[PDB]
Amino acid sequence: PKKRASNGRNKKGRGHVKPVRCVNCSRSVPKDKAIKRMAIRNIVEAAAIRDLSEASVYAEYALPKTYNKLHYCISCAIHARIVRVRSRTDRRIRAPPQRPRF
Amino acid sequence: MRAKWRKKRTRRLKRKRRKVRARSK
Amino acid sequence: VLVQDLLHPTAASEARKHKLKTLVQSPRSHFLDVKCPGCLNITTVFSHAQTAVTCESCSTVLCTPTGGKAKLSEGTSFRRK
Amino acid sequence: GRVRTKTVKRASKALIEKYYPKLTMDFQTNKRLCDEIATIQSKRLRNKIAGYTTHLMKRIQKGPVRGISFKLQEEERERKDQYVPDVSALDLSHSNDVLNVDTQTAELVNSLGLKLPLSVSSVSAVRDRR
Amino acid sequence: KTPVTLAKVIKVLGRTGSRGGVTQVRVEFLEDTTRTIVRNVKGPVREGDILVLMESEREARRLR
Amino acid sequence: DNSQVFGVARIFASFNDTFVHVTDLSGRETIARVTGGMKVKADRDESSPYAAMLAAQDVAAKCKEVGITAVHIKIRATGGTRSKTPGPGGQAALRALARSGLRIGRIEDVTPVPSDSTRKKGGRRGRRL
Amino acid sequence: AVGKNKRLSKRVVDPFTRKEWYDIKAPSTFENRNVGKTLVNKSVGLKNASDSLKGRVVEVCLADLQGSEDHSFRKVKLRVDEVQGKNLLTNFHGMDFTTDKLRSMVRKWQTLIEANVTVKTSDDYVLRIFAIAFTRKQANQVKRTSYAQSSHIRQIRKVISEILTREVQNSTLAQLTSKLIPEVINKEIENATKDIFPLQNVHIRKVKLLKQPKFDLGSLLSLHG
RNA sequence: CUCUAACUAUAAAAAUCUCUCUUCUC
RNA sequence: GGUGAAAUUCUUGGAUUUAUUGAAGACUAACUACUGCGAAAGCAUUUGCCAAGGACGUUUUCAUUAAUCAAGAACGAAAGUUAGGGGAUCGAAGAUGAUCAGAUACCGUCGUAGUCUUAACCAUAAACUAUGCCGACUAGGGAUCGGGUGGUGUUUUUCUUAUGACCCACUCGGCACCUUACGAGAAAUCAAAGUCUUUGGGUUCUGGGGGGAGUAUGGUCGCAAGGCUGAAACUUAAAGGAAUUG
Ligand SMILES: [Mg+2]
Ligand SMILES: [Mg+2]
Ligand SMILES: [Mg+2]
Ligand SMILES: [Mg+2]
Ligand SMILES: [Mg+2]
Ligand SMILES: [Mg+2]
Ligand SMILES: [Mg+2]
Ligand SMILES: [Mg+2]
Ligand SMILES: [Mg+2]
Ligand SMILES: [Mg+2]
Ligand SMILES: [Mg+2]
Ligand SMILES: [Mg+2]
Ligand SMILES: [Mg+2]
Ligand SMILES: [Mg+2]
Ligand SMILES: [Mg+2]
Ligand SMILES: [Mg+2]
Ligand SMILES: [Mg+2]
Ligand SMILES: [Mg+2]
Ligand SMILES: [Mg+2]
Ligand SMILES: [Mg+2]
Ligand SMILES: [Mg+2]
Ligand SMILES: [Mg+2]
Ligand SMILES: [Zn+2]
Ligand SMILES: [Zn+2]
């Protein structure tokens, strides 16, 4: 049966999309159905920001961050907890799940 | 059964019979 | 909706709607009389003019090609005729 | 794992509703009360009702809350919602006499054909992102 | 070498581990009280105790 | 400068066997190549933070012996074709370098990233663990 | 951490005792002329240290070479050419962005514009310059995005191409670096392209050397002093 | 009726399975 | 190195990780979206040339020149096949060390043919929107892309009139989306899958229970793999769709 109106792909008018390889399982997958997470992260955690700070010349450093855009597959994503199997009536809500940190 | 492999078996039979016919002529 | 005078609609409805959709379709363009700064010779110009309409007297462009209404010479004087 | 089930809660709530003038914040006094003035077959259930009623007494004295609405609180709400201020706070009087409007509302007033003293002003129609 | 260290727990961070017996604790060292570190401890714990560490460099994550 | 002896830590942190390999500013002359696997016995906890921490401590001792005090860290992952993601050990190695006396400056992310080169390993359906 | 197959298909010496330190001096255009120190093997003829040194590259943040923090995201490469003794002189080699700022300003909902150019400088240096630009929300936006039409990218890209062509072919690498320090060329590009589209945060990326004339000893001597 | 910030990290192995299926009006 | 672990394999002839480089081949990240184009397959670095195309604008031109299409035709993913140019990664077949009862499978290290091209073919895919095309109408709301309209609109400064970019309002066209039934169906659901027992706008092509089987043979095209055309004998009372509860 029609599980999702958008076919769970989000292509709808492109015919074919360039495949991309999963970060973990290395599966080729259409770039739109290639669930994507902007892993923007500080290069060290708060448990070491101090340790680095007092061991730092150039007081009050900018502490540069590391950015990445993880292109998961879907099998790894569902297994590695990125995406969760939600209920039928809750599928149609495409907003991010309510401000991860508030 | 998965129709892919049934078709593969059928085409294997086709190849065998065609080779037999070619050897016959 | 469900009760309208399609025969006597408000003039605002006439203006807002696209042409070919009015009760009778009349092109939204028009003709203008324009005075070139150089010579006093008046010339008639279509609103969405296509080719650069230089006056027959002198090589002075009055309109410039554009997807819509042509752009004038910034000095000439136009009046809706 | 004591959660003071539905029956004791409803019984104490009804006791509140009908008897709040005649109740106190002391467990023993309310125990003797609820034993004398409400038929309770078992002593344990009586004591549970008295405890919940005393807890609700302390709650009500801490402040009126949901669900409980007895005669005194209802009378307070009656005398409190009938509050009528002085001059109507619109009254063409407050907020710089002759109130501010917008040009479009001004021309509504003009088209109406009535006086309605006025003060025209524009809007600076810039739409803020906010 | 005897670099034994002492640390007082200020907050109990629930309990971690598949066994369900090991506690994450946020301990501030008795020496250099300005510094805090989170570590795993096996056995009953309550805030206000003071605990002993053979190593203080190791940061302890969840025990999977 | 305060008469300092600058260096570069340039940690390489894969998902196995975190690397700590300090060299000079020119980048050619190497100091204290000791890695995570050097200091753990299992050959499989090499990516664990303990290996990186002991490697970093030994690097720090060698640096104090050779005079290099302040460092310019260049954090690296395997990157390129492989997962573009920093390993867990390298961060702990960086922290251990921070603790043991040495000073830091201009920590850098030097992860090698391709512009879609290298039709890479895995096959169509990829890993099937 | 013990032994291995050792498929060989003591005599140990100390690494540092036979080693020695050298100093690095920056071009006079840079603010903090003293850069740092580099490790060498001890000087022995027949492969003197001089042969090993000339050609090395030193990799230093621009904020280090100026002092202020506004130059944190930039990062200059210097080429080792001349050895003076206990101190070596280095000519300009290249200049680059730190990957962090680049990855930070490449966001969604604003397409980028890249402009590559290969140009000879004033004197003889063949160089390659990249320019990175990002579309800007005008401070009245209600449309949540700022895409630019490929005609606009064509115009902006070409304009940057001639801008870099002029600014490199006219002045030498020293004067080039003089324009590079206070990023006057960036604001110049922003102004020259202001009529096309807002174009937030233009910048010069990966100033990459390609070719150098012979040595020009006198140029190096004038550079450092 | 003025509001655009914070983050972590697991995939060892696991095959097979007998009867006997039927009943709602006042 | 690599993994859940374990070796396979390279290593003081200094493997791995270092700095410069150079080589060939590949692709064109990050921007990259419920976003653009094209008949479909498909198409993503820059620049020049070549022609082409939709939409908009048009008080320009011909006046039925139109739609669908049996026959015929052009494109037509990947894989495959010829030869020649390439030869990096990756990698079907093979070679290897682990998993297990066995594993020539899943994890791993090499690895031909293939991936890349130039001519020559082949014409099939879950080629899917599983919805043929052209028409007309029916319900509200937002945004988005392309175009054109008005803004005494705002930012822009080349004093400033012009641009450009936004903001607003309107309109034409496309990918779409949200609410809803007052219609539809079996229902999932659909704003088309509606305007259908109140059965009729024009049109091509498909199917008659399930296996046999898209198989036998006959053609037909192809060097080859096979493609298109395509049954029966016989067997069976179900196979199947959708949702419901365990
Ligand atoms: Mg299903
Ligand atoms: Mg999706
Ligand atoms: Mg699995
Ligand atoms: Mg080596
Ligand atoms: Mg576009
Ligand atoms: Mg299309
Ligand atoms: Mg791109
Ligand atoms: Mg036909
Ligand atoms: Mg092919
Ligand atoms: Mg070949
Ligand atoms: Mg085996
Ligand atoms: Mg095999
Ligand atoms: Mg299995
Ligand atoms: Mg394999
Ligand atoms: Mg391989
Ligand atoms: Mg077919
Ligand atoms: Mg079909
Ligand atoms: Mg079709
Ligand atoms: Mg049949
Ligand atoms: Mg069949
Ligand atoms: Mg045939
Ligand atoms: Mg079903
Ligand atoms: Zn995956
Ligand atoms: Zn004239």
Coordinates of N, CA, C and O (backbone and C1' of nucleotides) in Angstrom, one line a residue, chain I residues 156-215:
Chain I
rU156 P 21.1 52.3 3.1 O5' 20.8 53.2 1.8 C5' 21.8 53.4 0.8 C4' 21.9 52.1 0.0 C3' 23.0 52.1 -1.1 O3' 24.3 51.9 -0.7 C1' 20.9 51.1 -1.9
rU157 P 25.3 53.1 -0.6 O5' 25.0 53.9 -1.9 C5' 25.6 53.5 -3.2 C4' 26.1 54.6 -4.0 C3' 26.9 55.6 -3.2 O3' 28.0 56.2 -4.0 C1' 25.1 56.7 -4.1
rU158 P 29.4 55.4 -4.2 O5' 29.9 55.8 -5.6 C5' 29.1 55.7 -6.8 C4' 28.7 57.0 -7.4 C3' 27.3 57.5 -7.1 O3' 27.3 59.0 -7.1 C1' 27.7 57.3 -9.5
rC159 P 27.1 59.7 -5.7 O5' 25.6 59.9 -5.5 C5' 24.9 60.9 -6.2 C4' 25.1 62.3 -5.7 C3' 24.1 62.9 -4.8 O3' 24.1 62.3 -3.5 C1' 25.2 64.5 -6.1
rU160 P 22.7 62.1 -2.7 O5' 21.6 62.6 -3.8 C5' 20.7 61.7 -4.3 C4' 20.1 62.2 -5.6 C3' 19.2 61.2 -6.4 O3' 17.9 61.1 -5.9 C1' 20.7 62.4 -7.9
rU161 P 16.9 59.9 -6.4 O5' 16.3 60.4 -7.7 C5' 16.1 59.5 -8.8 C4' 15.9 60.2 -10.1 C3' 15.9 59.3 -11.4 O3' 14.6 58.6 -11.5 C1' 17.2 61.2 -11.8
rA162 P 14.5 57.0 -11.6 O5' 15.9 56.6 -12.3 C5' 16.0 56.9 -13.7 C4' 16.9 55.9 -14.4 C3' 16.7 54.4 -14.0 O3' 15.6 53.8 -14.5 C1' 19.0 54.9 -14.1
rU163 P 15.0 52.5 -13.8 O5' 16.0 51.3 -14.2 C5' 16.5 50.4 -13.3 C4' 17.9 50.0 -13.6 C3' 18.3 48.6 -13.0 O3' 17.8 47.5 -13.8 C1' 20.0 50.2 -12.7
rG164 P 16.7 46.5 -13.1 O5' 17.6 45.6 -12.1 C5' 18.8 45.0 -12.5 C4' 19.7 44.8 -11.4 C3' 19.2 44.1 -10.2 O3' 19.2 42.7 -10.3 C1' 20.3 46.0 -9.4
rA165 P 18.1 41.7 -9.8 O5' 18.1 41.9 -8.2 C5' 19.3 41.5 -7.4 C4' 19.0 41.8 -6.0 C3' 17.6 41.4 -5.5 O3' 17.5 40.1 -5.2 C1' 18.3 43.5 -4.7
rC166 P 16.0 39.5 -4.9 O5' 15.9 39.7 -3.3 C5' 14.6 39.9 -2.7 C4' 14.6 40.9 -1.6 C3' 13.2 41.4 -1.1 O3' 12.8 40.5 -0.1 C1' 14.5 43.3 -1.6
rC167 P 11.4 39.7 -0.3 O5' 10.3 40.8 0.3 C5' 10.6 41.5 1.5 C4' 9.6 42.5 1.8 C3' 8.2 42.3 1.1 O3' 7.4 41.4 1.8 C1' 9.0 44.5 0.6
rC168 P 6.4 40.4 1.0 O5' 5.2 41.4 0.5 C5' 4.6 42.2 1.5 C4' 3.8 43.3 0.8 C3' 2.8 42.8 -0.2 O3' 1.6 42.3 0.3 C1' 4.0 44.7 -1.1
rA169 P 1.0 40.9 -0.1 O5' 0.0 41.3 -1.3 C5' -0.8 42.4 -1.2 C4' -1.2 43.0 -2.5 C3' -1.5 41.9 -3.6 O3' -2.7 41.3 -3.5 C1' -0.2 43.7 -4.5
rC170 P -2.9 39.8 -4.1 O5' -3.0 40.0 -5.6 C5' -3.9 40.8 -6.3 C4' -3.6 40.9 -7.7 C3' -3.4 39.6 -8.5 O3' -4.6 38.9 -8.8 C1' -1.9 41.3 -9.2
rU171 P -4.6 37.3 -8.9 O5' -3.9 37.1 -10.4 C5' -4.5 37.7 -11.5 C4' -3.6 37.7 -12.7 C3' -3.0 36.3 -13.1 O3' -3.9 35.6 -13.9 C1' -1.3 38.0 -13.1
rC172 P -4.0 34.0 -13.8 O5' -2.9 33.5 -14.8 C5' -3.0 33.9 -16.2 C4' -1.8 33.5 -16.9 C3' -1.2 32.1 -16.6 O3' -1.8 31.1 -17.3 C1' 0.5 33.7 -16.6
rG173 P -2.1 29.7 -16.5 O5' -0.8 28.9 -16.6 C5' -0.2 28.6 -17.9 C4' 1.2 28.2 -17.8 C3' 1.6 27.2 -16.8 O3' 1.3 25.8 -17.2 C1' 3.1 29.0 -16.6
rG174 P 0.9 24.7 -16.1 O5' 2.3 24.3 -15.4 C5' 3.2 23.5 -16.2 C4' 4.5 23.2 -15.4 C3' 4.2 22.5 -14.0 O3' 3.9 21.1 -14.1 C1' 5.8 24.2 -13.7
rC175 P 3.3 20.3 -12.9 O5' 4.5 20.0 -11.9 C5' 5.6 19.3 -12.4 C4' 6.8 19.3 -11.4 C3' 6.4 18.9 -10.0 O3' 6.4 17.5 -9.8 C1' 7.8 20.9 -9.9
rA176 P 4.9 16.8 -9.7 O5' 4.6 16.7 -8.1 C5' 3.9 17.8 -7.5 C4' 4.7 18.4 -6.3 C3' 4.0 18.5 -5.0 O3' 3.9 17.3 -4.3 C1' 5.0 20.5 -5.5
rC177 P 2.6 16.9 -3.5 O5' 2.6 17.9 -2.3 C5' 3.7 18.0 -1.3 C4' 3.5 19.1 -0.4 C3' 2.2 19.1 0.5 O3' 2.3 18.2 1.6 C1' 2.6 21.3 -0.3
rC178 P 1.0 17.5 2.2 O5' 0.3 18.7 3.0 C5' 0.9 19.3 4.1 C4' 0.0 20.4 4.6 C3' -1.4 20.0 4.9 O3' -1.7 19.3 6.1 C1' -1.3 22.1 3.8
rU179 P -2.8 18.2 6.2 O5' -4.2 19.1 6.3 C5' -4.4 19.9 7.4 C4' -5.7 20.7 7.3 C3' -6.9 19.8 6.9 O3' -7.5 19.1 8.0 C1' -6.8 21.8 5.6
rU180 P -8.0 17.6 7.8 O5' -9.4 17.9 7.0 C5' -10.4 18.8 7.5 C4' -11.4 19.2 6.4 C3' -12.0 18.0 5.7 O3' -13.1 17.4 6.3 C1' -11.2 19.6 4.1
rA181 P -13.5 15.9 6.1 O5' -14.6 16.0 5.0 C5' -15.7 16.9 5.1 C4' -16.5 17.0 3.8 C3' -17.2 15.6 3.5 O3' -18.4 15.9 2.8 C1' -15.6 16.2 1.8
rC182 P -19.7 16.4 3.7 O5' -20.0 17.8 3.1 C5' -21.3 18.1 2.5 C4' -21.2 18.1 1.0 C3' -20.8 16.8 0.3 O3' -21.5 16.7 -0.9 C1' -19.3 18.6 -0.2
rG183 P -22.0 15.3 -1.5 O5' -21.1 15.0 -2.7 C5' -20.8 13.7 -3.2 C4' -19.8 13.6 -4.3 C3' -19.1 12.3 -4.5 O3' -19.9 11.4 -5.2 C1' -17.5 14.1 -4.5
rA184 P -20.1 9.9 -4.6 O5' -18.8 9.1 -5.0 C5' -18.3 9.1 -6.3 C4' -16.8 8.9 -6.4 C3' -16.2 7.6 -5.8 O3' -16.3 6.6 -6.7 C1' -14.9 9.5 -5.1
rG185 P -17.6 5.6 -6.8 O5' -17.0 4.2 -7.0 C5' -16.7 3.4 -5.9 C4' -15.2 3.4 -5.6 C3' -14.8 2.4 -4.5 O3' -14.6 1.1 -5.0 C1' -13.9 4.6 -4.1
rA186 P -15.7 0.0 -4.9 O5' -15.4 -0.8 -3.6 C5' -16.1 -0.6 -2.4 C4' -15.2 -0.9 -1.2 C3' -14.4 0.3 -0.7 O3' -15.1 1.1 0.3 C1' -13.0 -1.6 -1.0
rA187 P -14.3 2.1 1.2 O5' -13.5 1.3 2.3 C5' -12.8 1.9 3.3 C4' -11.3 1.5 3.2 C3' -10.3 2.6 3.1 O3' -10.0 3.2 4.3 C1' -9.8 0.9 1.5
rA188 P -9.4 4.7 4.4 O5' -7.8 4.4 4.0 C5' -7.0 3.7 4.8 C4' -5.7 3.3 4.1 C3' -4.9 4.4 3.5 O3' -4.1 5.0 4.5 C1' -5.1 2.7 1.9
rU189 P -3.9 6.6 4.6 O5' -3.3 7.0 3.2 C5' -3.7 8.2 2.5 C4' -4.3 7.9 1.1 C3' -4.7 9.1 0.3 O3' -3.6 9.7 -0.3 C1' -6.4 7.4 0.2
rC190 P -3.5 11.3 -0.4 O5' -4.2 11.6 -1.8 C5' -3.8 10.8 -3.0 C4' -4.9 11.0 -4.1 C3' -5.3 12.4 -4.4 O3' -4.4 13.1 -5.2 C1' -7.2 11.0 -4.1
rA191 P -3.7 14.5 -4.7 O5' -4.6 15.6 -5.3 C5' -5.9 15.9 -4.8 C4' -6.7 16.8 -5.7 C3' -6.1 18.2 -5.8 O3' -6.3 18.7 -7.1 C1' -8.3 18.4 -5.0
rA192 P -5.2 18.4 -8.3 O5' -6.0 17.5 -9.3 C5' -5.3 16.5 -10.1 C4' -5.6 15.1 -9.7 C3' -6.1 14.2 -10.8 O3' -5.6 12.8 -10.5 C1' -7.7 14.3 -9.1
rA193 P -5.7 11.7 -11.6 O5' -6.6 10.6 -11.0 C5' -7.5 9.8 -11.8 C4' -8.5 9.1 -11.0 C3' -9.4 9.9 -10.0 O3' -10.7 9.3 -9.9 C1' -8.1 8.4 -8.8
rG194 P -11.9 9.8 -10.8 O5' -12.6 10.9 -9.9 C5' -13.4 10.6 -8.8 C4' -14.3 11.8 -8.5 C3' -15.3 12.2 -9.6 O3' -16.5 11.5 -9.6 C1' -14.1 14.1 -8.9
rU195 P -17.3 11.1 -10.9 O5' -17.9 12.5 -11.4 C5' -18.8 13.2 -10.7 C4' -19.1 14.6 -11.2 C3' -19.5 14.6 -12.7 O3' -20.8 14.4 -12.9 C1' -17.7 16.2 -12.3
rC196 P -21.3 13.4 -14.1 O5' -21.6 12.0 -13.4 C5' -20.6 11.0 -13.4 C4' -21.2 9.6 -13.3 C3' -21.5 9.1 -11.9 O3' -22.7 8.3 -12.0 C1' -20.0 7.6 -13.1
rU197 P -23.8 8.3 -10.8 O5' -25.1 7.8 -11.5 C5' -25.1 6.6 -12.2 C4' -26.4 5.9 -12.3 C3' -27.1 5.6 -11.0 O3' -28.5 5.8 -11.1 C1' -26.8 3.6 -12.2
rU198 P -29.2 7.1 -10.6 O5' -28.8 8.2 -11.6 C5' -29.3 8.1 -13.0 C4' -28.9 9.4 -13.7 C3' -27.5 9.7 -13.9 O3' -27.3 10.4 -15.1 C1' -28.3 11.3 -12.5
rU199 P -27.0 9.7 -16.5 O5' -25.8 8.7 -16.2 C5' -24.5 9.2 -15.9 C4' -23.5 8.1 -15.9 C3' -23.0 7.7 -17.3 O3' -21.6 7.3 -17.2 C1' -24.0 5.8 -16.2
rG200 P -20.5 8.4 -17.6 O5' -20.7 8.6 -19.2 C5' -21.6 9.6 -19.7 C4' -21.1 10.1 -21.0 C3' -21.7 11.4 -21.5 O3' -20.7 12.2 -22.2 C1' -22.2 9.8 -23.1
rG201 P -19.6 13.0 -21.5 O5' -18.6 13.6 -22.6 C5' -19.2 14.2 -23.7 C4' -18.1 14.9 -24.6 C3' -17.2 13.9 -25.3 O3' -17.7 13.3 -26.5 C1' -16.0 15.7 -24.3
rG202 P -17.2 11.9 -26.9 O5' -15.8 12.2 -27.6 C5' -15.7 13.1 -28.7 C4' -14.3 13.1 -29.2 C3' -13.6 11.8 -29.3 O3' -14.0 11.0 -30.4 C1' -12.1 13.3 -28.3
rU203 P -13.6 9.5 -30.5 O5' -12.1 9.5 -31.1 C5' -11.3 8.4 -30.9 C4' -9.9 8.8 -30.4 C3' -9.1 7.7 -29.7 O3' -8.4 6.9 -30.7 C1' -9.1 9.6 -28.3
rU204 P -9.1 5.8 -31.5 O5' -8.0 4.8 -31.9 C5' -7.5 3.9 -30.9 C4' -6.1 4.3 -30.5 C3' -5.3 3.3 -29.7 O3' -4.7 2.3 -30.5 C1' -5.1 5.4 -28.6
rC205 P -5.2 0.8 -30.5 O5' -4.4 0.1 -29.3 C5' -3.1 0.6 -29.1 C4' -2.6 0.2 -27.7 C3' -3.2 -1.1 -27.1 O3' -2.5 -2.2 -27.6 C1' -3.3 0.6 -25.5
rU206 P -3.1 -3.7 -27.3 O5' -2.4 -4.0 -25.9 C5' -3.0 -4.9 -25.0 C4' -2.8 -4.4 -23.6 C3' -3.6 -5.2 -22.5 O3' -2.9 -6.4 -22.1 C1' -4.0 -2.9 -22.2
rG207 P -3.4 -7.8 -22.5 O5' -4.3 -8.3 -21.3 C5' -3.9 -8.2 -20.0 C4' -5.0 -8.5 -19.0 C3' -6.1 -9.4 -19.5 O3' -5.7 -10.8 -19.2 C1' -7.1 -7.5 -18.6
rG208 P -6.4 -12.0 -20.0 O5' -7.7 -12.3 -19.2 C5' -7.7 -12.6 -17.9 C4' -9.0 -12.8 -17.3 C3' -10.0 -13.7 -18.0 O3' -10.8 -14.4 -17.1 C1' -11.0 -11.6 -17.8
rG209 P -10.2 -15.8 -16.4 O5' -10.5 -15.6 -14.9 C5' -10.1 -14.4 -14.2 C4' -9.5 -14.8 -12.9 C3' -8.1 -15.4 -12.9 O3' -7.1 -14.4 -12.9 C1' -9.5 -16.8 -11.6
rG210 P -5.6 -14.6 -13.5 O5' -5.0 -15.7 -12.5 C5' -4.7 -15.4 -11.1 C4' -4.2 -16.6 -10.4 C3' -3.0 -17.3 -10.9 O3' -1.8 -16.6 -10.6 C1' -4.6 -18.9 -10.4
rG211 P -0.4 -16.8 -11.5 O5' -0.3 -18.3 -11.6 C5' 1.0 -18.9 -11.8 C4' 1.0 -20.4 -11.5 C3' 1.6 -21.3 -12.6 O3' 3.0 -21.4 -12.5 C1' -0.5 -22.1 -12.0
rG212 P 4.0 -20.9 -13.7 O5' 3.7 -22.0 -14.8 C5' 3.8 -23.4 -14.5 C4' 3.2 -24.2 -15.6 C3' 3.7 -23.9 -17.1 O3' 4.9 -24.5 -17.3 C1' 1.3 -24.2 -17.0
rA213 P 6.1 -23.6 -17.9 O5' 5.9 -22.1 -17.2 C5' 6.9 -21.2 -17.2 C4' 6.5 -19.8 -17.6 C3' 5.6 -19.1 -16.6 O3' 5.8 -17.7 -16.8 C1' 4.4 -19.4 -18.6
rG214 P 6.8 -16.9 -15.8 O5' 7.5 -15.8 -16.8 C5' 6.7 -15.1 -17.7 C4' 6.6 -15.7 -19.1 C3' 7.7 -15.3 -20.0 O3' 8.0 -16.5 -20.9 C1' 5.7 -14.7 -21.0
rU215 P 9.4 -16.7 -21.5 O5' 9.4 -18.3 -21.9 C5' 10.1 -19.3 -21.2 C4' 9.4 -20.6 -21.2 C3' 9.2 -21.2 -22.6 O3' 10.4 -21.9 -23.1 C1' 7.3 -21.4 -21.3

